[PDB]
């Protein structure tokens, strides 16, 4: 009952009778050759025209085709039936099994929970990772974000967190792959299915090959599946593989939607697009969502508008850096930029808090000397400041750890380090009780015991 | 070029002319308006920045072949939007919408030489089947084409000429 009138890249304009124009976010349908193409309207231009985004390949569309108005928004399968299966942005099953026997379908556009319904939790969550749970401990039901450039470890860290908390966790889990490699999605699907945990994970995948609209709405499609388990009374884990692609897909489409560019070419509505998503991924009195989000920062510029506007939406922020990863120090967390809302004397105890702050102080004091060391050499440093440097370097190395998911790279077996066991090692290194041991005794060891043991072999 | 800005006005003028069964009067009124735009002195006036409602009035003055309300009103609206120069194209799209409504087409026939007027009859009869429209013919003669015929129906052409066959064979090799 409508005609196409323009096809610019990924956006399509459709003309309808004045009295039947669809509403915003309703879904239309066309026939692109043999296939059926779903459009989602973004704007109601004047005169019955409506401007839409194609959820599929836009090639092959002529003008004047006839499009049908489906009178409901995009709706996805939801609930228990969607568990252990892979789905499109449109909720269609993408593994070669049959239909999803869903009893209910939910619109992917929803309002965030009211302020009255929110809930706050001080219950610490423990992970096997030294640096994360010393510098930036995070709590059940809270948001976590791994900030880093390209190729620094923010996917390997997310797979390690999945390993350490997701298998030892009762409730279900949801994994949304937003604009990342299909290879990694296949690898993760098969690793899960081979350990029989797949029947606890729901997967959504709008990987990098797909046109902008799929990457644009796949994140919402995942949040809906998560919100369902939350409202059912359960507690959920939500892993988003790269939330930067959700805004990159908005930037790709913005100019075609006829909107004046902004700070660095970004859409004028960047902060609202980002908030309208991250405000509904929260825990509430009727259930809790625990979420880990990888956040790519373009060109390693931590001040680009997209990371800068994301920082405000996370409780614990872990900032990876290339200058550390280039030292072979994995994980490459930058201890002088990672933080957590949960690092307070009240929440984590005076001993943990004090050790974390001492480590920060030492590493910063070492940063301040790095230029005088560069120009004048290390022999000009006062004897007090040469001890600071050696302890700083020992601490730099002791934050490294082997991961079970990185055996494929280094061959060394992974390690799981309890919190009680790491604050002790750092208290020791700082207080000086290990101040007679070569630095390389600390590279890639689990606990301080293993370091004093490795020193025997040099 | 005003191909795009003329569409709303042509559509509105045609929908109005239908309600009152005056399509022929509207078409002639528009054909006169589009000629008032081409006069050497009026084209000077349309460019200089006059206030829309005085430009519209001085344009209405030069035309007494426009019916009291509805032609004058169309001129006033286009003048308010500053689009009086678009009239020559409003006319073309009005003629097009009319041809579509009355289910008519006008197909060109290009030949090396005039046709037998039985050939023309068969061509019109065949096209009136290819197209639902009653079709006019205006045969034309070109001698670069050397045998066969070209039938052009809007943006659809049937390259029956032998010149086409030659150029299409040369590029097979």
């Amino acid at each position: 009952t409508g005609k196409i009138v323009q096809v610019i890249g990924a956006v399509v304009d459709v003309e309808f009778p004045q009295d039947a124009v669809p509403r915003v976010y309703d879904a239309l349908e066309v026939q692109n050759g043999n296939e059926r193409l779903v459009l989602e309207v973004q704007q109601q231009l004047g005169g019955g025209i409506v401007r839409t985004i194609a959820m599929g390949s836009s090639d092959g569309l002529r003008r004047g085709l006839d499009v049908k108005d489906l009178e409901h928004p995009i709706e996805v399968p939801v609930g228990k039936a969607t568990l252990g299966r892979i789905m499109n942005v449109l909720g269609e099953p993408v593994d070669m099994k049959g239909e999803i026997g869903e009893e209910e379908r939910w619109a992917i556009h929803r309002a965030a929970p009211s302020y009255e319904e929110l809930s706050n939790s001080q219950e610490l969550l423990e992970t096997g990772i030294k640096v994360i749970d010393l510098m930036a401990p995070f709590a059940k039901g809270g948001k976590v974000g791994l900030f880093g450039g390209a190729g620094v470890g923010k996917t390997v860290n997310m797979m390690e967190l999945i390993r350490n908390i997701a298998i030892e966790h009762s409730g279900y889990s949801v994994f949304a792959g937003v604009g990342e490699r299909t290879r990694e999605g296949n690898d993760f699907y098969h690793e899960m299915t081979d350990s029989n945990v797949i029947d606890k994970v729901s997967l959504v995948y709008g990987q990098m090959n797909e046109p902008p609209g799929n990457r644009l709405r796949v994140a919402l499609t995942g949040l809906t599946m998560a919100e369902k388990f939350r409202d059912e009374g359960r507690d959920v884990l939500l892993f988003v593989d790269n939330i930067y692609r959700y805004t990159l897909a908005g930037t790709e489409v913005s100019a075609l939607l006829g909107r004046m560019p902004s700070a660095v070419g970004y859409q004028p509505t960047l902060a609202e697009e980002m908030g309208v998503l991250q405000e509904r991924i929260t825990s509430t009195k009727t259930g809790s969502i625990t979420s880990v989000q990888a956040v790519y920062v373009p060109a390693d510029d931590l001040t680009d508008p997209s990371p800068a506007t994301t920082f405000a939406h996370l409780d614990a922020t872990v900032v990876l850096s290339r200058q550390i990863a280039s030292l072979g120090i994995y994980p490459a967390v930058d201890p002088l930029d990672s933080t957590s809302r949960q690092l307070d004397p009240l929440v984590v105890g005076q001993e943990h808090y004090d050790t974390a702050r001492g480590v920060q102080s030492i590493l910063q004091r070492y940063q301040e000397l790095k230029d005088i060391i560069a120009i004048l050499g290390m022999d000009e440093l006062s004897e007090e400041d040469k001890l600071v440097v050696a302890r700083a370097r020992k601490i730099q190395r002791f934050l490294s750890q082997p991961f079970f998911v990185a055996e494929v790279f280094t061959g060394s077996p992974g390690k799981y380090v309890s919190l009680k066991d790491t604050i002790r090692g750092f208290k020791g290194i700082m207080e000086g009780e290990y101040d007679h041991l070569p630095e390389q005794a600390f590279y890639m060891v689990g606990s301080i015991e293993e370091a004093v043991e490795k020193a025997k072999k040099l | 070029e005003f191909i795009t800005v003329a569409r709303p006005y042509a559509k509105a003028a045609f929908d109005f002319a239908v309600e009152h069964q005056s399509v022929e009067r509207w078409q002639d009124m528009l054909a006169f308006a589009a000629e008032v735009t081409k006069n050497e002195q009026m084209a000077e006036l349309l460019s200089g920045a006059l206030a829309p409602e005085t430009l519209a009035e001085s344009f209405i003055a030069v035309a007494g072949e426009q019916l009291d309300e509805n032609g004058q009103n169309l001129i006033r609206v286009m003048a308010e939007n500053g689009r009086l120069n678009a009239l020559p194209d409003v006319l073309e799209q009005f003629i097009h919408l009319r041809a579509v409504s009355e289910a008519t087409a006008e197909v060109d026939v290009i030949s090396a030489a005039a046709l037998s007027e039985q050939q023309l009859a068969k061509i019109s009869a065949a096209m009136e089947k290819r197209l639902s429209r009653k079709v006019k013919l205006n045969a034309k003669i070109d001698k670069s084409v050397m045998a066969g015929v070209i039938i052009r129906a809007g943006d659809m052409v049937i390259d029956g000429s032998v010149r086409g066959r030659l150029e299409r064979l040369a590029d097979v090799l």
Binding site: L61, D95, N209, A255, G411 | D155
Partner: protein, 513 residues
């Protein structure tokens, strides 16, 4: 003898016989504008986005925009001779490229037109240039190895069939060399190869073709070329043509390898085409979708499971798995590994080989910089023997290279750091290698054996070269069977470890090099 005039005449005769004279109805439009290679066509009520529009002459144009009243298109060739008013014909074809195994050994334009003088193509139909890569369920984990000729990358940075491995560095550091040395090495391993050159000088391409012919590899490679002089719409569309030619092998259960000579110049040509359309630019003036440009390209280099190969080929091929391996090359200014486009492609591929200029100027070639180059498929893509001997060798060289930074002045612990330094130094002196000298997995393996099981402390930095030359000649002379065995298999066992130790002490003692 073989200039059979009767053969030419029969060819043309078959063509004249295999003709179609019946007329056909097509849709027409008129060019309204021409500027900087972009065309504006009025009419074509029945054009479809992505279509090929045919212009006066035999040139083509691609439809990018279907505006309300006009079609926007870019000319795939010299546009200067087009003029307003010319008619154009809408072919019902989305952008298509000849594909087949008959293209092997030809040098081809981005539209598939052969630019060498050797006449028309034999090809198995046409493939769409723009396609969506296989889904997540259709992939399979990369298992098999792809052997380059170089100890450095085959040991530290393995490449598996189906991987995508960025070769990144500064100008004149040996990228093209490292890539065509991987192309030459597949001469006998059954992997068809494709080399696409975007924005290169014509002299360089002619020279590279002459080398590919000098080592016999040309009969196994397709060359898709869009030189620095060609339109920005051929440069921008070339790598998609090359990937469409490689997917032909991928989808039939075979193996292929494709090299994009500069995906930095493709980005520049796309930036040109985008700015000429007045599209708001982003960082470094690149468009918004400069990531999607490389994403939808490199995501096609995939490995597919046997069910995809069956379903695609209508069941003609059972049990096989196809793969397309990609080696995109990127150029970075002043070694700046943190610009926009370099970082995008590092974020799209499955690793990077980072060629550093300080090493290249110091005579270390291939100048692989360990500590910045990784292979995210890790050892899964190595042969068992290589995976064993190599181990953490790369992080070992990274440690040695950083230690050299501080030991430059002075060091303590100065016997263990001393033996560490000597070992690492001899290893770097052993990893450098000459151009056009590939060495089988057997030779790399036994040389790494000699490197790791001591056996090299005594021989000087001046003799490493000689040690290797002798070692390899001796083993070629005597233990030809053991080489024939290690080359046929992953070939690792305590039996083979013992055989190698025996050869090592024999050469070490009785041979004098």
């Amino acid at each position: 003898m073989q200039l059979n005039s009767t053969e030419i005449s029969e060819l043309i005769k078959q063509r004249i016989a295999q003709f179609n004279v019946v007329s056909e109805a097509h849709n027409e439009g008129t060019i309204v504008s021409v500027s900087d290679g972009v065309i504006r066509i009025h009419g074509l009520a029945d054009c479809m986005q992505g279509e090929m529009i045919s212009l006066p002459g035999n040139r083509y144009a691609i439809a990018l925009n279907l505006e309300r009243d006009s079609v926007g298109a870019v000319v795939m060739g010299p546009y200067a001779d087009l003029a307003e008013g010319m008619k154009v014909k809408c072919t019902g074809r989305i952008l298509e490229v000849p594909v087949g195994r008959g293209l092997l050994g030809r040098v081809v334009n981005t539209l598939g037109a052969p630019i060498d003088g050797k006449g028309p193509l034999d090809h198995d139909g046409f493939s769409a240039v723009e396609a969506i890569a296989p889904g997540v369920i259709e992939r399979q984990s990369v298992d098999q190895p792809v052997q380059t000729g170089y100890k450095a990358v085959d040991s530290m940075i393995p490449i598996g069939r189906g991987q995508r491995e960025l070769i990144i560095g500064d100008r004149q550091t040996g990228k093209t060399a490292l890539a065509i040395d991987a192309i030459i090495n597949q001469r006998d391993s059954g992997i068809k190869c494709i080399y696409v050159a975007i924005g290169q000088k014509a002299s360089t391409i002619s020279n590279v073709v002459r080398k590919l012919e000098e080592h016999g590899a040309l009969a196994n490679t397709i060359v898709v070329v869009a030189t620095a002089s060609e339109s920005a719409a051929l440069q921008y569309l070339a790598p998609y043509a090359g990937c469409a030619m490689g997917e032909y092998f991928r989808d039939r259960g075979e193996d292929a390898l494709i090299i994009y000579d500069d995906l930095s110049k493709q980005a520049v040509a796309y930036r040109q085409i985008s700015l000429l359309l007045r599209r708001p630019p982003g960082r470094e003036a690149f468009p918004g979708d400069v990531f999607y440009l490389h994403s939808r390209l490199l995501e096609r280099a995939a490995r597919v499971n046997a069910e995809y190969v069956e379903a695609f080929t209508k069941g003609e091929v059972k049990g096989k798995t196809g793969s397309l391996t990609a080696l995109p090359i990127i150029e970075t200014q002043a070694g700046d590994v943190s610009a926009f486009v370099p970082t995008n492609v590092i974020s799209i591929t499955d690793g990077q080989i980072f060629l550093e200029t300080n090493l290249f100027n110091a005579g270390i070639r291939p100048a692989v910089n360990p500590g910045i180059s990784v292979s995210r498929v890790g050892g899964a893509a190595q042969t068992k023997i290589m995976k064993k001997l190599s181990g953490g060798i790369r992080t070992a060289l990274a440690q040695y290279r950083e230690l050299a930074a501080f030991s430059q002045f002075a060091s303590d612990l100065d016997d263990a750091t001393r033996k560490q330094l000597d070992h690492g130094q001899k290893v770097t002196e052993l990893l450098k290698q000459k151009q056009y000298a590939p060495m089988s997995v057997a030779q790399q393996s036994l040389v790494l054996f000699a490197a790791e099981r001591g056996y090299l402390a005594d021989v000087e930095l001046s003799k490493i070269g000689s040690f290797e030359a002798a070692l390899l000649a001796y083993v070629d002379r005597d233990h030809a069977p053991l080489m024939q065995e290690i080359n046929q298999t992953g070939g690792y066992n305590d039996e083979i470890e013992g055989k190698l130790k025996g050869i090592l002490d024999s050469f070490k003692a009785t041979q004098s090099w």
